Amino acid sequence: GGVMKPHRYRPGTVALREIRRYQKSTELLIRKLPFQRLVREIAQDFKTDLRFQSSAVMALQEASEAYLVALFEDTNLCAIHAKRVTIMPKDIQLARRIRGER
Amino acid sequence: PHRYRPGTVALREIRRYQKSTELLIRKLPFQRLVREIAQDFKTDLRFQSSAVMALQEASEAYLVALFEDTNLCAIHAKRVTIMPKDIQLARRIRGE
Amino acid sequence: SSKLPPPQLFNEACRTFQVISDCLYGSRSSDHDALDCDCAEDWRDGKNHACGEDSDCINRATKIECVIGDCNCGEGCQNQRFQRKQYAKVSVIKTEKKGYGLRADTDLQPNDFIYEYVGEVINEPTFRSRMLKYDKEGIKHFYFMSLTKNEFVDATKKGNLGRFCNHSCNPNCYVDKWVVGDKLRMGIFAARYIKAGEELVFNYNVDRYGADPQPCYCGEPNCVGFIGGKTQT
Amino acid sequence: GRSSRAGLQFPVGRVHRLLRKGNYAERVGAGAPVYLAAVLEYLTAEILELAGNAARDNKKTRIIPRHLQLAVRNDEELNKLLGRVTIAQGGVLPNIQSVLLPKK
Amino acid sequence: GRSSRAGLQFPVGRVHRLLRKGNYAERVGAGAPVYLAAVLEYLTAEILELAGNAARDNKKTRIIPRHLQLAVRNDEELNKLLGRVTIAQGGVLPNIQSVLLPK
Amino acid sequence: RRKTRKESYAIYVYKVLKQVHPDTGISSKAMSIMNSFVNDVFERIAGEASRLAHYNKRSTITSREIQTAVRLLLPGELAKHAVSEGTKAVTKYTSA
Amino acid sequence: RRKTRKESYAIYVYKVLKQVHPDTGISSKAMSIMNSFVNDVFERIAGEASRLAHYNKRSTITSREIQTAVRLLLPGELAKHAVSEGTKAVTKYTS
Amino acid sequence: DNIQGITKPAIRRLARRGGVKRISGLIYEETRGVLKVFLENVIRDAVTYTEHAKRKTVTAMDVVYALKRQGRTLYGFG
Amino acid sequence: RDNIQGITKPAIRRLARRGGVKRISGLIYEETRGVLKVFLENVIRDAVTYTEHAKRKTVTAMDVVYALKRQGRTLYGF
DNA sequence: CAGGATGTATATATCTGACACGTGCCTGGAGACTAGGGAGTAATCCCCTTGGCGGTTAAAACGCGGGGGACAGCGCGTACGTGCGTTTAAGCGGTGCTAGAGCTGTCTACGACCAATTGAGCGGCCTCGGCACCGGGATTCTCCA
DNA sequence: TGGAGAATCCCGGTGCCGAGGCCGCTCAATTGGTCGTAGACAGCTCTAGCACCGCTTAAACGCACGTACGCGCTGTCCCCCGCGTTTTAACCGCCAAGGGGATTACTCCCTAGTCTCCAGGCACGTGTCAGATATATACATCCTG
Ligand SMILES: [Zn+2]
Ligand SMILES: [Zn+2]
Ligand SMILES: [Zn+2]
């Protein structure tokens, strides 16, 4: 008999499918609890035994995700400018340089 | 018949104009540009000399920063010249 | 080419079955709702295809098909073709060693819709039941392809013209997964230039459970004598 | 009510109180709260209208943050006014670069 | 004078008057203008000291805008404090990218 | 016993929504977003009117200062219609 | 003498310059830049203290608001030395 | 160590919302570094507001005002 | 009129030299003139708005500085 | 070879969590009146803006040769996308405990406020030297034999 | 690589106007009383944040495979640069009206503060519905005799 495995999707097709799915939805893309642990670890270096409201961690996660999404949008535009379709660390560093954060 | 290579004069001008501090746009043409732009908002506007100098300073500083970032984009794209799409990219990254 | 040069029927032909063209599966998916895109048509009477077959329409670029009637282009959307059957022209040629080939009937432009493999989609215990009943019955031709990893397709019961193919180590067509009506389906597409007459044979990439396959009669230096899959199951 | 006298929905009185006790100037004119309430109600109506149209075009009857995000980012002028604000749980506009699509 | 009592050169009285008449709060604490004058004196002293150093490094004893520019841009924290600031007649740092230099 | 009287623009945004589209509702989080937006626009216009009063050595925010702030803040047709609405409002208010 | 009094920070910036650099002068344009800079930083710090007082339902700008605004606006080592100078000045002034 | 808790698939998803099609393997360290700098600045300003207000909990309003100070005002929390 | 061509090619080339540019495409000059027209249009618009509010007929240096301040490109020395 | 118990897909009456509307209450808004000071308006002055003219000459325009860098194709290899199977924390709910936010009460220190005073600081004018500019030689960099 | 050549740098000499200081003046800064509300502080309440735990399962992870895309090389060609020659208009100094910014004088209406009163807005129950869920139910699977 035998299982007959056909050809998979070409590289990029599932990627574009994810592009459309995540640009159409609104749920958070970062895991809430690991991010909360990251927030408490970063806050540790200023005041010991700091407490956070859940809405504060949620506002930080929203702000963080919006900032990274906008940075990757700018990175994608500079990447596509340079005749590539693959972003590189240099691209993000260029984005931050032009934005004035460096 | 002694000619410089296409580009060393560019570097000497870069060192020269980055070393000096003076307005690089011609005063009277820029003042005519300012008055022309101002005509479409209110008729018979007067300008203090210091206001035109402040406009020329801000104009030169903004263009300098824009060209510096456009140059960084050009170098990023494995080139040494600037193209219109580099300026459009720079202004897009900035947020206009 | 013209290597597989009296065409045969479907039910010098192969074994009999029932010709199907619709969804007559076992139970069922894909769950991906394709929403109505704002594609500009250039279509009133068919001067150009609305969701064009090789232009930049967002639905066709990701192996997604519009449903008929709900996309903004209406019915002229060429990315509706699994629901409207814009198939190519093949026929059934009898070959003494390759068996039955889908000979091309018109000279086919590369990178276009050729045909669709439709049949019965089933799960794994009923699938191994089909395997056991068929190799206890004694068939020598096996259509136990996998739509997804879980489900499987079979066309010898109620299939269509996509049965008459084989394995070639140099493929001319290929098969790729598409989605239509929230249903995952399969389509065979060309990649190279296709001339009328030669059989359209691709890479099966079978992981056969048996030990003795028929040899790959492609006769090329790229053929290892047998087919070549992924795992030795 | 002072709001009904100007034909506005937004509270002229509350705006007047916020202006006096919000530490913006020593004195606040009488026409300033009326004018400010008019501008606030107009901008609120414009963005709620664009959001409502976006929600109705997506076959929903409840305005959600996503529809506000679309309302802002799809109207050039409001985009300019609100270019540096983040709308909570709003996502981004569907924008796929042409170059990312397959070739001929 | 309250300036000499607090050991500051900036006028705490003037700062206090600007705070009261500047529509910042209804009441202004007595320690606030002293603290603000101290912070202004520190920032002014840092920028002036760096501009002076740069001026000696250009064989000039009179600080001109170019020296203030060099002073601002060579201090990373002042550059961060003044990233949206433009100094008139300041010019630009001598920064030539490596890729343009002859090889 | 109730907790604390906290004010918001909730009911006014809801009345405006019922005035422009009676059969449309709004989520609580969206109402929060609208409240933050109204407070933001308010803070910007009040800050600019404050700076205008300060720069011209005046201690009164009148409808003129708000009008100039509106012309500075809204880009184009938004400003033109905002000035139209404000003029209507102030006129009808002072003439009744 | 038939001219409106236009205040400045000129003489104080000059005093600070003479205290930090013994033999050094300063041009008119550089003094204008420094004066606008001092007015700018003053406006920033006072605005930040004003909004900080407003946020916490306070109506008074005390040393605390100025201290927090200075720590918010000045990056790193600048903030450290500025808060040191502020505390020093208030300590001397209350005595 | 918790900066690696913002896992590589999540970073990929973040890029996916931004329209990125292919991602180099070296991106993830740069992205975690950028995230660390941004969160450090916003959290530092939030902690400065809490220390001023004599409260031990970082409140939502503190985060909103901290973000607004850096020109990234956030709607939907007050 | 067509006085915007008063900003000539070598002056734009000078600004570019100060910006670190080494080679300039021919289209850069028209693109820069258009960008500068947009920028100056916005700044002069804000300046004229300040001047008309102040009941003055001359745009002063302070109006231009405050206008630049509104756009986060503050100018010192006027 | 045989039905019964069992597993599975299907349509379903229902359950939940978020939203629209009615209820009591309280505090802030509205109305009314008065005082004082900011501002509105007329009037005058005089600074500095606008306009003009003429001579200088430096920069801009323009033309042309040429080189080197942009761009496109080709080819190549490796790294990243996709997928499968394995595992693990994420998430959810459920439970418990107490820190601290939030509100109140009382009191007091601290700043608003006002009048008198006086010197710090600002405008005007006056002086001399740092610098802007120029010329001459010296070094430094570039490029072609 | 070194000599020629152009560009720039350094180093003194002259002129000049602007920095820096003094003088007279005025109004804002300082001091001393006087008071009234903001806030510091202790206490109490009650929400909500943190901590733990079990369970389920969706996503992360690791490896395998393969292809397509990044990157380096090479050719072509064309466009911008270096530079010389010609032209035009900016620029600098000087002058002449005169417009309008800035100040003055004085009045007066508009807004802060206070007092009086009541209903609009907010917290909270109460009812209603998209969307998810446990449940009757039809058809195929195994299951033992
Ligand atoms: Zn389409
Ligand atoms: Zn379509
Ligand atoms: Zn073969």
Author numbering:
A (entry chain E): 33 to 134
B (entry chain A): 38 to 133
C (entry chain S): 80 to 84, 88 to 93, 101 to 117, 121 to 325
D (entry chain C): 16 to 119
E (entry chain G): 16 to 118
F (entry chain D): 26 to 121
G (entry chain H): 26 to 120
H (entry chain F): 24 to 101
What does the paper say about this structure?
One of the essential histone modifications, histone H3 lysine 36 methylation (H3K36me) is deposited by the Set2 methyltransferase onto the H3 tail and is conserved from yeast to humans. Set2 is recruited by phosphorylated C-terminal domain of RNA Polymerase 2 during transcription and catalyzes H3K36 methylation over gene bodies. In this study, we present 3.8 Å cryo-EM structure of Set2 bound to the mimic of H2B ubiquitinated nucleosome core particle (NCP). Our structure shows that Set2 makes extensive interactions with H3 αN, H3 tail, H2A C-terminal tail, and stabilizes DNA in an unwrapped conformation.
To visualize the mechanism of H3K36 methylation, we assembled the complex of Set2 and the mimic of H2B ubiquitinated nucleosome, the substrate of Set2. To stabilize the complex we have introduced H3K36M mutation, recently identified in childhood cancers. In initial 3D reconstruction, with overall resolution at 3.4 Å, a noisy density representing Set2 domain was present near the DNA entry/exit site of the nucleosome. ~14% of the initial particles contained Set2 and further focused classification improved the Set2 density yielding a map at 3.8 Å (Set2:NCP). Remarkably, not only NCP, but also Set2 is resolved to high resolution allowing us to describe interactions in molecular details. Although we used full-length Set2 for the complex formation, in our map we observe only densities for the AWS and the SET domains. The DNA unwrapping is required for Set2 to bind H3K36 that is located close to the DNA entry/exit site of the nucleosome. The conserved positively charged Set2 residue R117 binds the backbone of the unwrapped DNA at SHL 5.5 and stabilizes the open conformation. In addition to the DNA, Set2 makes multiple interaction with histones H3 and H2A that position Set2 catalytic domain for functional interaction with H3K36. In addition to prevailing charged interactions, our structure shows that Set2 binds hydrophobic patch of the nucleosome formed by the H2A C-terminal tail and the H3 αN. In conclusion, our data show that Set2 interactions with the H3 αN and the H2A C-terminal tail position Set2 on the nucleosome to specifically bind and methylate H3K36.
